[PDB]
Design an enzyme around this catalytic site. Structure first.
Site, PDB file in Angstrom:
ATOM      1  N   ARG A  66      -9.634   1.698  -0.090  1.00  0.00           N
ATOM      2  CA  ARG A  66     -10.165   0.506  -0.746  1.00  0.00           C
ATOM      3  C   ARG A  66     -10.770  -0.464   0.260  1.00  0.00           C
ATOM      4  O   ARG A  66     -11.690  -1.219  -0.087  1.00  0.00           O
ATOM      5  CB  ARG A  66      -9.077  -0.189  -1.564  1.00  0.00           C
ATOM      6  CG  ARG A  66      -7.658  -0.163  -0.978  1.00  0.00           C
ATOM      7  CD  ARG A  66      -6.864  -1.388  -1.486  1.00  0.00           C
ATOM      8  NE  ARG A  66      -5.496  -1.519  -0.984  1.00  0.00           N
ATOM      9  CZ  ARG A  66      -5.071  -2.455  -0.140  1.00  0.00           C
ATOM     10  NH1 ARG A  66      -5.901  -3.327   0.410  1.00  0.00           N
ATOM     11  NH2 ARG A  66      -3.774  -2.532   0.145  1.00  0.00           N
ATOM     12  N   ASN A  87       7.777   7.628  -0.476  1.00  0.00           N
ATOM     13  CA  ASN A  87       6.762   7.934  -1.475  1.00  0.00           C
ATOM     14  C   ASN A  87       5.784   8.947  -0.897  1.00  0.00           C
ATOM     15  O   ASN A  87       4.708   8.603  -0.400  1.00  0.00           O
ATOM     16  CB  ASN A  87       6.055   6.660  -1.915  1.00  0.00           C
ATOM     17  CG  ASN A  87       4.894   6.950  -2.820  1.00  0.00           C
ATOM     18  OD1 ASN A  87       4.832   8.024  -3.427  1.00  0.00           O
ATOM     19  ND2 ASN A  87       3.957   6.017  -2.909  1.00  0.00           N
ATOM     20  N   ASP A  88       6.140  10.222  -1.002  1.00  0.00           N
ATOM     21  CA  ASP A  88       5.197  11.282  -0.686  1.00  0.00           C
ATOM     22  C   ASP A  88       4.423  11.727  -1.915  1.00  0.00           C
ATOM     23  O   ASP A  88       3.286  12.197  -1.801  1.00  0.00           O
ATOM     24  CB  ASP A  88       5.933  12.477  -0.083  1.00  0.00           C
ATOM     25  CG  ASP A  88       4.981  13.502   0.497  1.00  0.00           C
ATOM     26  OD1 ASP A  88       4.199  13.128   1.403  1.00  0.00           O
ATOM     27  OD2 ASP A  88       5.017  14.674   0.054  1.00  0.00           O
ATOM     28  N   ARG A 116      -1.471  -6.451   9.268  1.00  0.00           N
ATOM     29  CA  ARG A 116      -0.762  -5.701   8.242  1.00  0.00           C
ATOM     30  C   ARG A 116      -0.092  -4.469   8.826  1.00  0.00           C
ATOM     31  O   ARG A 116       1.017  -4.116   8.415  1.00  0.00           O
ATOM     32  CB  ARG A 116      -1.719  -5.324   7.113  1.00  0.00           C
ATOM     33  CG  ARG A 116      -1.905  -6.433   6.107  1.00  0.00           C
ATOM     34  CD  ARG A 116      -3.216  -6.328   5.355  1.00  0.00           C
ATOM     35  NE  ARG A 116      -3.354  -7.380   4.355  1.00  0.00           N
ATOM     36  CZ  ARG A 116      -2.756  -7.383   3.167  1.00  0.00           C
ATOM     37  NH1 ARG A 116      -1.945  -6.410   2.800  1.00  0.00           N
ATOM     38  NH2 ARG A 116      -2.970  -8.397   2.334  1.00  0.00           N
ATOM     39  N   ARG A 133      -8.492  -8.808  -5.142  1.00  0.00           N
ATOM     40  CA  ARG A 133      -9.189  -7.550  -4.928  1.00  0.00           C
ATOM     41  C   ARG A 133      -9.824  -7.072  -6.230  1.00  0.00           C
ATOM     42  O   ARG A 133      -9.385  -7.443  -7.318  1.00  0.00           O
ATOM     43  CB  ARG A 133      -8.209  -6.489  -4.425  1.00  0.00           C
ATOM     44  CG  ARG A 133      -7.542  -6.849  -3.108  1.00  0.00           C
ATOM     45  CD  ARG A 133      -6.314  -6.034  -2.910  1.00  0.00           C
ATOM     46  NE  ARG A 133      -5.679  -6.384  -1.646  1.00  0.00           N
ATOM     47  CZ  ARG A 133      -4.465  -5.988  -1.292  1.00  0.00           C
ATOM     48  NH1 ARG A 133      -3.719  -5.258  -2.102  1.00  0.00           N
ATOM     49  NH2 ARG A 133      -3.983  -6.346  -0.104  1.00  0.00           N
ATOM     50  N   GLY A 187       0.783  -1.221   0.000  1.00  0.00           N
ATOM     51  CA  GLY A 187       0.000   0.000   0.000  1.00  0.00           C
ATOM     52  C   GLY A 187       0.820   1.277   0.000  1.00  0.00           C
ATOM     53  O   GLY A 187       0.261   2.354  -0.223  1.00  0.00           O
ATOM     54  N   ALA A 188       2.125   1.194   0.226  1.00  0.00           N
ATOM     55  CA  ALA A 188       2.943   2.394   0.309  1.00  0.00           C
ATOM     56  C   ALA A 188       3.526   2.811  -1.036  1.00  0.00           C
ATOM     57  O   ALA A 188       4.134   3.886  -1.130  1.00  0.00           O
ATOM     58  CB  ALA A 188       4.065   2.195   1.334  1.00  0.00           C
ATOM     59  N   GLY A 189       3.360   1.997  -2.077  1.00  0.00           N
ATOM     60  CA  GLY A 189       3.704   2.444  -3.415  1.00  0.00           C
ATOM     61  C   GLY A 189       4.450   1.464  -4.290  1.00  0.00           C
ATOM     62  O   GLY A 189       4.457   1.642  -5.509  1.00  0.00           O
ATOM     63  N   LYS A 190       5.092   0.435  -3.721  1.00  0.00           N
ATOM     64  CA  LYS A 190       5.933  -0.410  -4.563  1.00  0.00           C
ATOM     65  C   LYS A 190       5.161  -1.002  -5.745  1.00  0.00           C
ATOM     66  O   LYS A 190       5.689  -1.066  -6.861  1.00  0.00           O
ATOM     67  CB  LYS A 190       6.593  -1.504  -3.723  1.00  0.00           C
ATOM     68  CG  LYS A 190       5.640  -2.511  -3.056  1.00  0.00           C
ATOM     69  CD  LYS A 190       6.378  -3.407  -2.066  1.00  0.00           C
ATOM     70  CE  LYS A 190       5.421  -4.364  -1.385  1.00  0.00           C
ATOM     71  NZ  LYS A 190       6.142  -5.197  -0.350  1.00  0.00           N
ATOM     72  N   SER A 191       3.903  -1.412  -5.540  1.00  0.00           N
ATOM     73  CA  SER A 191       3.160  -2.091  -6.596  1.00  0.00           C
ATOM     74  C   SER A 191       2.738  -1.114  -7.684  1.00  0.00           C
ATOM     75  O   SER A 191       2.873  -1.410  -8.879  1.00  0.00           O
ATOM     76  CB  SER A 191       1.951  -2.820  -5.992  1.00  0.00           C
ATOM     77  OG  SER A 191       1.117  -3.440  -6.961  1.00  0.00           O
ATOM     78  N   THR A 192       2.249   0.060  -7.285  1.00  0.00           N
ATOM     79  CA  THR A 192       1.914   1.096  -8.253  1.00  0.00           C
ATOM     80  C   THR A 192       3.135   1.535  -9.052  1.00  0.00           C
ATOM     81  O   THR A 192       3.037   1.788 -10.256  1.00  0.00           O
ATOM     82  CB  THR A 192       1.305   2.294  -7.531  1.00  0.00           C
ATOM     83  OG1 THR A 192       0.128   1.870  -6.826  1.00  0.00           O
ATOM     84  CG2 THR A 192       0.970   3.410  -8.521  1.00  0.00           C
TER      85      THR A 192
HETATM   86  N1  LIG Z   1       7.997 -13.195   0.146  1.00  0.00           N
HETATM   87  C1  LIG Z   1       7.084 -12.839  -0.794  1.00  0.00           C
HETATM   88  N2  LIG Z   1       6.228 -11.831  -0.548  1.00  0.00           N
HETATM   89  C2  LIG Z   1       5.307 -11.500  -1.490  1.00  0.00           C
HETATM   90  C3  LIG Z   1       5.250 -12.161  -2.695  1.00  0.00           C
HETATM   91  N3  LIG Z   1       4.235 -11.585  -3.418  1.00  0.00           N
HETATM   92  C4  LIG Z   1       3.711 -10.594  -2.665  1.00  0.00           C
HETATM   93  N4  LIG Z   1       4.358 -10.569  -1.478  1.00  0.00           N
HETATM   94  C5  LIG Z   1       4.214  -9.573  -0.412  1.00  0.00           C
HETATM   95  O1  LIG Z   1       3.162  -9.855   0.464  1.00  0.00           O
HETATM   96  C6  LIG Z   1       2.716  -8.595   1.060  1.00  0.00           C
HETATM   97  C7  LIG Z   1       1.225  -8.537   0.970  1.00  0.00           C
HETATM   98  O2  LIG Z   1       0.797  -8.347  -0.379  1.00  0.00           O
HETATM   99  P1  LIG Z   1      -0.710  -7.937  -0.687  1.00  0.00           P
HETATM  100  O3  LIG Z   1      -1.568  -9.027  -0.076  1.00  0.00           O
HETATM  101  O4  LIG Z   1      -0.885  -6.597   0.003  1.00  0.00           O
HETATM  102  O5  LIG Z   1      -0.816  -7.868  -2.202  1.00  0.00           O
HETATM  103  C8  LIG Z   1       3.434  -7.473   0.290  1.00  0.00           C
HETATM  104  O6  LIG Z   1       4.581  -7.021   1.022  1.00  0.00           O
HETATM  105  C9  LIG Z   1       3.891  -8.189  -0.970  1.00  0.00           C
HETATM  106  O7  LIG Z   1       5.000  -7.610  -1.628  1.00  0.00           O
HETATM  107  C10 LIG Z   1       6.159 -13.194  -2.917  1.00  0.00           C
HETATM  108  O8  LIG Z   1       6.184 -13.827  -4.002  1.00  0.00           O
HETATM  109  N5  LIG Z   1       7.038 -13.508  -1.952  1.00  0.00           N
END
Ligand SMILES: Nc1nc2c(ncn2[C@@H]2O[C@H](COP(=O)(O)O)[C@@H](O)[C@H]2O)c(=O)[nH]1
Ligand SMILES: [K+]
Length: 193
Positions: A137, A171-172, A148, A44, A14-19
């Site tokens: 969301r 990420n501001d 979390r 989601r 949620g802090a930005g890595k995915s976006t």
């Molecule tokens: N170790 C690991 N973490 C993951 C993997 N895929 C997603 N995550 C991590 O699990 C956390 C939760 O992801 P979310 O459920 O919010 O999409 C995030 O920190 C995300 O990067 C993975 O393949 N391996």
């Protein structure tokens, strides 16, 4: 192994890595490819199987884990996540730079492998801002939200560990954080071109 140096992003979800990764793959799709992790959590709205994740059941993941199909895996806030061998191989076969997003456990897992990535952490400007962004969301039960937030606090605390991350981005502003992501990869982007 063969191919350019992979890129591992971490930081609170949620802090930005995915976006930021999604933005990088739009701008530089000829240079980068995304590792599609497996997860047992539910999708989601807007997420797409085979793009954001492979969404499988615990039983199916466990079969694949038992077969040796995973580079790494982790338990996070009640669900299982992992990077399959084929997910990374698919990108390497395209001669593209593999980009991954994982949690802190995944960072530690990959440190023990032969992948030799660059490690980039993407941080929120505060826990308070992260919590507000997440409640928009509102995809999580309260129990999951609690787990979390605990994991996010641990992540932020560890982001300043010497030698863990190559760069830590706050990420501001997404435009600013995205410029800093490309900055960290600028030599690799130039060489790929
Ligand atoms: N170790 C690991 N973490 C993951 C993997 N895929 C997603 N995550 C991590 O699990 C956390 C939760 O992801 P979310 O459920 O919010 O999409 C995030 O920190 C995300 O990067 C993975 O393949 N391996
Ligand atoms: K992932």
């Amino acid at each position: 192994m063969s191919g350019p140096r992979p890129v591992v992003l971490s930081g609170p979800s949620g802090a930005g890595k995915s976006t930021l990764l999604k933005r990088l793959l739009q701008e530089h799709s000829g240079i980068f490819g995304f590792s599609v992790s497996h997860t047992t959590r539910n999708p989601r709205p807007g997420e797409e199987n085979g793009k954001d994740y492979y969404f499988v059941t615990r039983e199916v993941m466990q079969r694949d884990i038992a077969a040796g199909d995973f580079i790494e895996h982790a338990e996070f806030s009640g669900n299982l996540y992992g990077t399959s061998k084929v997910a990374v191989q698919a990108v390497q076969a395209m001669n593209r730079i593999c980009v991954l997003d994982v949690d802190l456990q995944g960072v530690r897992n990959i440190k023990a492998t032969d992948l030799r990535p660059i490690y980039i952490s993407v941080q929120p400007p505060s826990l308070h801002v992260l919590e507000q962004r997440l409640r928009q969301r509102n995809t999580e039960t309260e129990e999951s939200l609690v787990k979390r937030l605990a994991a996010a606090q641990a992540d932020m605390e560890s982001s300043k560990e010497p030698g863990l991350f190559d760069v830590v981005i706050i990420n501001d502003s997404l435009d600013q954080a995205y410029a800093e992501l490309k900055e960290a990869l600028s030599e690799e982007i130039k060489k790929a071109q």
